Symmetry: D2
Subunit: 463 residues, 4 copies
Amino acid sequence: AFRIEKDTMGEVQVPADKYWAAQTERSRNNFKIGPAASMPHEIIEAFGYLKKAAAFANTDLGVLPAEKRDLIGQACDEILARKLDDQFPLVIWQTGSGTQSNMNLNEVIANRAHVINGGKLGEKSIIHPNDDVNKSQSSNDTYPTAMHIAAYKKVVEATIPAVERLQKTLAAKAAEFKDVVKIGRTHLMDATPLTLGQEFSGYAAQLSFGLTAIKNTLPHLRQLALGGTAVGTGLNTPKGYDVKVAEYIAKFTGLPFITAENKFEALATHDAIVETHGALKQVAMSLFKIANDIRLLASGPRSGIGEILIPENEPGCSIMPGKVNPTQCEAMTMVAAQVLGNDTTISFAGSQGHFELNVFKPVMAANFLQSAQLIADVCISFDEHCATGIQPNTPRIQHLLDSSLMLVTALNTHIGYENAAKIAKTAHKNGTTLREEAINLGLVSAEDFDKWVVPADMVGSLK
Amino acid sequence: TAFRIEKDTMGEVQVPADKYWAAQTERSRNNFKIGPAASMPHEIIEAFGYLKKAAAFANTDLGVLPAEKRDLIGQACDEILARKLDDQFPLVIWQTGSGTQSNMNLNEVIANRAHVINGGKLGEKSIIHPNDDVNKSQSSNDTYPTAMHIAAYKKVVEATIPAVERLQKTLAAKAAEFKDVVKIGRTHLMDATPLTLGQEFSGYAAQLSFGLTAIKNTLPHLRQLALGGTAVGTGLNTPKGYDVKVAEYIAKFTGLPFITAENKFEALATHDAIVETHGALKQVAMSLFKIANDIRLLASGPRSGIGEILIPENEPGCSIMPGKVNPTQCEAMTMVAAQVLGNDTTISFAGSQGHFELNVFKPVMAANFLQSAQLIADVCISFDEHCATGIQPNTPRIQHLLDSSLMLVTALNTHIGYENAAKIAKTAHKNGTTLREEAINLGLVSAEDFDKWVVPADMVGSLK
Amino acid sequence: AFRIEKDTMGEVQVPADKYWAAQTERSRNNFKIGPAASMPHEIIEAFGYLKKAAAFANTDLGVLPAEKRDLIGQACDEILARKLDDQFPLVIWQTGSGTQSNMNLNEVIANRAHVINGGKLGEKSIIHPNDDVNKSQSSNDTYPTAMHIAAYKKVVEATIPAVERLQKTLAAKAAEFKDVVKIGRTHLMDATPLTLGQEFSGYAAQLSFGLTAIKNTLPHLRQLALGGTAVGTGLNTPKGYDVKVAEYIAKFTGLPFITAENKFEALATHDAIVETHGALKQVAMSLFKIANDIRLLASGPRSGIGEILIPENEPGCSIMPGKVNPTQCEAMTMVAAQVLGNDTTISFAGSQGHFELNVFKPVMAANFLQSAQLIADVCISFDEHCATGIQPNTPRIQHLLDSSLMLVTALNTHIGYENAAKIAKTAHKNGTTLREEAINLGLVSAEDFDKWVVPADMVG
Amino acid sequence: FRIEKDTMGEVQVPADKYWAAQTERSRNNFKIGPAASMPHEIIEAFGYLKKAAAFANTDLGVLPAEKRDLIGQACDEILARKLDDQFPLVIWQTGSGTQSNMNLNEVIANRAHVINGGKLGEKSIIHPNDDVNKSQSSNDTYPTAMHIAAYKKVVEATIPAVERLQKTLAAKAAEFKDVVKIGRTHLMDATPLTLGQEFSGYAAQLSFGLTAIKNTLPHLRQLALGGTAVGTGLNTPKGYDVKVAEYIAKFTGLPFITAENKFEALATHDAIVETHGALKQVAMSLFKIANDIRLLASGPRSGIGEILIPENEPGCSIMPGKVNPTQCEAMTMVAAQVLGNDTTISFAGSQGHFELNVFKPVMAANFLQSAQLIADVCISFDEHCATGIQPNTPRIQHLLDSSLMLVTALNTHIGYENAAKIAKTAHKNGTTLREEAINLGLVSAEDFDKWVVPADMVGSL
Ligand SMILES: O=C(O)/C=C/C(=O)O
Ligand SMILES: O=C(O)/C=C/C(=O)O
Ligand SMILES: O=C(O)/C=C/C(=O)O
Ligand SMILES: O=C(O)/C=C/C(=O)O
């Protein structure tokens, strides 16, 4: 069942029930690319905030009647309350400006305003999509505004807290394991001792510098395009609109948005998405390493390293009965893989602006949100279902520590490099302990080796 | 909201009473809340349906599974292939790197659904055991990569290759249709020498021809199925010849020419075949990005750009600039190509990351591969129907830009030398005059020789 | 032609005239990968700084005799003054830790120290390559200290000043072209007016945001691993070594280096290299865009955009006589493409640390240093040879501005979107003017059109 | 300095150099990266194609035999490396590589003049544009240099280096076919396979990667030469395109042909994207294999240590006597480079405009570096690690008998849930599989000893 709606290109059959109009319907038919309604919901939600702020600012500045403001603001409250999700059917792989998603907000708000006000769907709306819902605005400033609201909100409300959660667990464990002495590995080969705390303190540190990197990118992402309209000059905006509309969005979201300092930079680039995604990708590579270590540390339990015990959450294996796997770690390394390709896509798209407009906005949008959501979700899962339950395998730690021929490094400042090297290669060649060959080569007394080669004394400076 | 108690080897689990999945699926659903729910691509669940039926038929032919049990497994698999059990697969991509949780989802749903088919009550342990019967002779470690290769191969020969062929042939037809339209070439974006619009479009059609061969070259590796490798590649716990027998049944049920992998260790420890065929997809993506980007430069304007071609005007371009029309079909294609490039970074990185007997990045690789295959398919169809089939020359515009170009003076090279031909062009440039005036004014060429040697239509081929 | 040197593995035939020893020679023969001596000179230089620092630190802490500090320092002063460049033949593609280059420094300092003291090359050195030159150090903490010193020095002495010089030319051009009204383009299609000034003001702002993104990463990049030794613990360092040695690096380099907060993160990762390189790659994607716009605006001169004129530095074409190309633009887009792939390499390698050490140190070092370098060089080349010489093509600009149908956008707040659309659509189909069709459709008086459709008035 | 002149005016050129005005402008105007970074491999390919051009130009009646011989001699001098200091131009030049095309054109013509008994500082008897560049553009020559140089390096260095490693890994799959070890999945103890079988996997990887590379050669052997300015072959004699490709096959000993479509051949580097894709597939495979061999080799006493590898140098300046899998690191580092090289190449591949892709030098440099590094580290790794790999036999047997997942052998006897009871109880009690199978009475001692045999677990029932 259809009704005819009209745009400046003529007549379009629109599903009779649906609040969208001609432009939303053409796009839904002209971009049959991947799954329906793939435009992020976070982008639509952002549009809810800024269309409502546009309306509010336009009335304060004398270009929209209060009557129309309130109908727009109520239809935006419905979008925000998730009452109209079945009214946003457009894909990511549309016009690169996101014009069709902007007109989807505009047509849905106008037709929904009309029915709120007592009219029939398919009657000329009391609210015009272009002249009223879109007054003072372009797809070219509204879509980048939706991008930064969705991006800033997800990064500060989901991603930073989730990464902070895992950072504090990792720092907690580092503290909890400060007196567990273990064997280091460089190049995967037996090395000198460090505490399990020291190992985890490295991991805690990785996310601390990553959190700082992400925070450093927020001043740029807080800047909103809204007011630059078609090309950044703010043609067709009342004076004060850029500052005023950013105060509404700031009031409505609770987040410290400001108007962009250079609206030509804010339309022709998404350098801010590149900037913040770069830092997300810094954290994804640190996360990869941490997850990879932890499965290596848990490997076995009998014929691997097996120096830690991780929580056992599920049957690991359909054929190998009673096998248990570090499945939280695999989740986290696969998210990290995804984030790095997301960064290729964003970097590539960011370089591809032409003149006044970057037209890679949706794909930049979709990839940034997916990275920020997946980092958030996997740090919560990995913290809950792995990191918090990590315990030492004490006897395994103690065996692999004691077997290291490279405890011989404690001897370096006492007998010199070459004499230390003779002891280790003699023990290796002969199949004996350091302590035997140190004594039998006449290079160290039994009491000096017992005093010097003490792993608990090899996890700090001399004294 | 109602519950029953299922058990696995780790303990009891509350499972939604109405659902056909069991304890392990319910564990995964609650333990891997990462991204949207049910993100594991339907093409993989579709592929598992094919391979699980084949497994049961193979196991029955080699006398290790009773026929009655093969029948019940086949009917539940058939209901998965007919899309009647889509609500019974809620597990995400970002699960165990092996896909063990999705393999158990299939096993559990086939077991319980089979139980109910036969007259049993959901909640009861099934006449068909999830591990000992549905999973007989199999591992997550050979089934998941078998599902990846079935889904990958099917999507490439049924969607992707057909779509790219469709667009290639349109660009070939437009090459033939525009063979006599002479236009100006551009190199480094500056005015150059003549070629036909048809020659320009022949570039585009040839790029997709070399694309189609590059992808087809990758199918030999992709048709190969890990099924029978089991846990580590050795085929532990398989009947003699199960590996070949199950590949025959997967080939028989899909209609596609699948074969058992030459080396099950390569088939479990790597997804080199997925890296291989994605690489070809990314080559096609890079070509398509270029063709699309050419078409928007060629149509740009309509007045203050190049504007040498007219494209179909599909929709209002702009909410604030009234009557603007944009190259939206070109923008969708360039945006997909950018996606396919990240996909390739992701797949190549995961592909390097296998350990000993198993690569545990299988879902991320599968998910990225299928998105690439599917988007390339859809955007090529969208672009063929809504842009390429409708492209026509702006003939007045083309002639103006062709007749303007100072580098028609290149045609003088063989007659008067580079150095004299350059004087003509620097003079005609300084003076705002034509090449012919300054070639005659400077006395470097007669009227008769200029007219003889400087024919745009002759400059589209070898010396005549 | 060869003399005998030994390591803990046995005897090696070393070229008799060279200052290196058994380990360098082994490395030279066993890693025949890429062009000879690929380890970047900046890593060697950084090493020159930190080996001197270590020696000076070791003496103030009473574990190295002053006579041996003096010898080691003189050898290091010779490295720093590029006297010893033919004593370093090892490749990037060696051990993942850079152990072999560490020992290259150790052996050449030790041997050079011997000869400075009055001995002869081939005699046992008065200075030990492990016990003295490498006292209190690992390859594990030295080679990251080398990377950070080289990477910091390059970014603050080369990359940032190059990028700052281009930013300022771009900003001068924004003020220079402040009243030059041109047509906007969105989707490559004719749009509404902005000044050439404003357009360049977007460029200047891009590089202002990039400079901020790079500097934000400098606090992490100035942290030095030196003192972590083998695994991060500072095994076999005197107390306060980590902090005394960073101060000497800082004093000798004149750069704000500090001992790392966490030595296990300093050894097990190169997250500082990933952070900073991410910022270099942001700037790189900004420069691509800017360079691609300038070529698009200069395109033609008769069959393109033609809105700017760029310096003409050279014949552009061996067959098309008199043709001239925007060749600086091309160099800058090619660098940008390099830096994106350098970023894939650094990110990927950055993820592949095991336990207490990332053993990708040189591949991360060489990609990093190339990006900092190529971005500094191309920013200087593009500034000198293109950006400072850009001029408007004013006749062409004006032609292209007054042709634009989307000047009609100016009618929106007066006659609405649908009426403005009917004027632009009608003008486009009939090949007539906006003004003509405004009047033919009865929608705007000729007076109102000429008051309302003013390009100079559409620019904010 | 001497004065040389181009169509733009006078240039002071180093008085002794065979290069001229345009080479000298490039040298001064693109001070980007280290000096003379244009790969020598491109210069060599230029020497082959400039000579083949002269040769074809003479047969087709449009260049005098005298001028052919002077260009051929200069070209043979470039080919044999007598003129490497006559090529001072960087990668980071004009994206067409015109300036390097004009470097070849200026050096051939000045060097031809001195052979013919002229002096540097006279116009050459041989015009760099009209004679050495006759029937040519940078637009077709540079992509011809690229393909010749790419194809040559791949078939003469990369493929043989990869096939040599492939051969060793195959020979090790035989050497070790009867050495039973424990497999790991998820880094966790699994079921047996032979160390032969595991190396069979590594051999299979490089076979597939080499096939993938060889599949891309039919594209890469196609030469742009004859397209000239925009792909039309403006100013080429009829047949020039086929005849010059014949001359190039003959000089090189490789089967080059003229490209089927000169527009594809100028406006794209799709053949580089194609072939480098397959280099990249091989590098990710090599990454996995190098990574496996350091994990298997790890220890000696506190890691896996299931293989011994050749000990080629002291591992560590502070950890005395330590020995590292240094060959594995070089290979994994090379692999990291090839991945990022593939990003650069793919980016540049997308960025052609109208009739010409002007990303040519950066595509070329990145391709040739991947092909050279894959070749160098594959020979180094085969010679200094792969050939000398041996099983650590006592260690293999300890780690094999330790795995609780030998219990898998009991699936088809007692079924999934009973097998898991034994492994879980064993894991819980810190006891042995045998102990607990027997202890719970799910298997007799006699049946267990017959049923749980690692050597019987590396094949089908
Ligand atoms: O939709 C807009 O507001 C703008 C579109 C464009 O610049 O084409
Ligand atoms: O689910 C499986 O069959 C295998 C899992 C594993 O190797 O751990
Ligand atoms: O060269 C070093 O000091 C350390 C090397 C290693 O960990 O093996
Ligand atoms: O150098 C050439 O032959 C071509 C250059 C160009 O097309 O501009």
